[model samples]
Structure formats: C-alpha cells, structure tokens
Target: GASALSLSLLSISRSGNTVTLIGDFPDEAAKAALMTALNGLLAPGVNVIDQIHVDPVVRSLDFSSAEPVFTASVPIPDFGLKVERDTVTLTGTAPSSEHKDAVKRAATSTWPDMKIVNNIEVTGQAPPGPPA
Candidate 1:
C-alpha cells in the first residue's frame, strides 16, 4: 500500500519485499514527503532503496544592465535565465510572464537581434497534475 502526493517520481523496481525509487525531485521537501509515504507502506521485513536525484528544471542566467555582451568576462548577477547550445539568452520573473517579457525587452534592446525565448512559469499556479 504505497501512495504519492504530488511526487514526480518513477518506480524503478519492486519485488515481493523490496522496492526502488528513482526520480528528479525539485527539492528536499518533496523528496522527504514522498519518502514518508512510501516507508509507511513497508512491513517489518521489507526493504526500501533510494536513488532519486535533485535536478532543477528551471534555467538560471546572469542579468544586469551594464553586463558585457560576450558570455565570458565578469560572472555578474548570474541568476535565472534560459540557455540553448551553450549560449546566453533572455531572462527574469514577476507577474511572472510580465517579468519574463520585461527581461525580453531589455535583452532585445541590447542585442536588438537574437532569438530569445522566455519559458518562465506563471504566477500563483500549482505545477499542474492530478490531485496527488
């Protein structure tokens, strides 16, 4: 009897008395909560194995008004930003979409000619899934 609450995980293996978990959890909180649920399902002789990794889906970028154009040089305010083929791209967050758009405006103003795509998540919204 195992249950998951909004867990983005995969079950790698399961035998009569053993179970293995594999996934890319966003953070420790999610991992911990799922582990609690799974552990509770085990009997006295059951064994559980953990192999989940914390992989971030969000891309981080360096942003600044006076930052250099080239990817090299000062590692300035390198925060949230998009990336594609080892190149620096558009950035930000707020209205969330508005913030991303603002970043686009500023970036295009500087470069004036580059394919920048903003994929920031919308504000006040759960990631999207069934009622886990």
Candidate 2:
C-alpha cells in the first residue's frame, strides 16, 4: 500500500566508451557524488552523458519484505542492497556465479515489476557439491 506516487530511479549504461546516466535523485549532493566518482574513473577520451534530475521529495522503496528476500538466499559476504523506487541494486562479493545468480533470482522473484541490478563480484571458489 503505497501512500504516494513520488518515485526515484537511477539507471546507468555504457556504450562505445560513452556512459549514460539517467534518473531522479533525492538531492544535488547525491547526484554530484555520483558524477564525481564516475568522472574520477573515466579513461581518456571517455564521455559521460548525465541526465539525472534532483527531486527532494523522492522516497526510497519499502524494505520490510525485501530484506527477507535477500537473507533467505545463499549468503553473500559483505552483502549490500540498495532499494529504490524502481530499481534494486545488489552489491558485495560472492563466492561464485551460482551464488550471485541465486541472489538475483531471489530479487526477481520478489519484485517482478522492479528492475534488478546485479553488481555482485565473484571472487572465491564455490564449495564442493553435497555428499552423493
């Protein structure tokens, strides 16, 4: 039961050395921070297209049920989840691609209408299969 219609969303994409950023942010500082961090890592000749808007009234999506959706999946080390009005961004290090996908699947199943961004990095080897 959403009380309001104000929604905030941020989407980033890259193509041919050009990065396009689009969406609504909560404040100027938040937008600036993203721009600064993006510009800091850009390579020579790379371009950035900023189409972000600031909306002070934008509110984050409720996480009461979302928390269990992630916690019930395969545990992720240093797990971090950012829930926006129209997007769910997952971060942290995973042990394998399977584990990462498991997390994304959980999110997808829970929020079929929202965009799920899987940013988890896999760094370790997965455990051996269970006893046969």
Candidate 3:
C-alpha cells in the first residue's frame, strides 16, 4: 500500500539569494520541517538560509527527448536547463503510460499537492539521477 500522506523528498534547494528552502514536500508540516533542516544546512558563522516553498512532484521524466541539451556556462551539455539546478532530478523508468502521465501532470502543476506523492508511489520511488 502507498502512504496517502506520503512526502517523498529526494533533495532540497536553498536559493543563494533569498535563502529560500524549496522542498519536495507533500504536506505543510513536512515543508516547514524541511525548511528547518535546510536552515540547518547553514550553521552559526558558517552560512545562512531563509524562507521556503514546497512544491511536490511524483517523478522525473523526459516528455520530449528532442536532443535535450541544457545550456550551460561551459561550451556544451547533454540535456538540462541553462541555469544552475536548485532541485533534484528523479531516476527510474515509468511503469506504464498511465504512470508517466501522472509524472507529467506533477511537473506541470504550480504547487503540487498530496497527489504528487500518490502518483509517484504507483511506480515506486527511486534515487534522483542528477541535478539539472
């Protein structure tokens, strides 16, 4: 069975400028807790962190793998966004078309909800591939 209250978070992001801890939390409490953990990423006299935003998602995927090359400061890249990635990219293959659709829906949403966690559980959780 899947945890309806599932809060699957593979990685977190702490914005350099705003110090915002962007997390993959399925619930408000987890989001807040992750923010606290992110702030912990910094320490007294070491570094600093601030506000946070939670946007949960089911999984990672490539809808259009059209030579997906992410622009980079370097000369070239294989596939990804031009800017530095603040989030984790999920790994593992989709179970089926239905499951993959869920992933895409998650990706498209503004502020995904518990459904994000629900969608991900269908195929099973996996370690994120890399930062995009």
Model 1 residue runs over 4 Å out of place are 1-9, 58-132
TM-score against native, each model: 0.34, 0.45, 0.23
All candidates in order of TM-score, best leading: 2, 1, 3
Candidate 1 clash pair list? 61-79, 61-80, 61-81, 62-78
lDDT of 2 by residue, 79-118 (tens): 5555465667877667678777777786777667677787
Clash statistics: count for each candidate: 4, 0, 1
User: How many clashes (backbone atoms < 3 Å, residues ≥3 apart in a chain or on different chains) does model 2 have?
Assistant: 0
Model 2: CA > 4 A from native: 1-58, 72-74, 124-132
lDDT of the candidates, in the order given: 0.41, 0.60, 0.31
Question: Quick one: ranking by lDDT, best first?
Answer: 2, 1, 3
**Cand. 3 Cα-lDDT:** 0.31
Q: What TM-score does candidate 2 reach?
A: 0.45
lDDT of 2: 0.60
Write model 3 residue lDDT over 19-111, tens digit each, in one string. 323334434565444344334333354333434344555322221221111111011111112111223242223445554454445344422
TM-score of 1: 0.34
Worst 10 residues of 2 by lDDT: 68-77
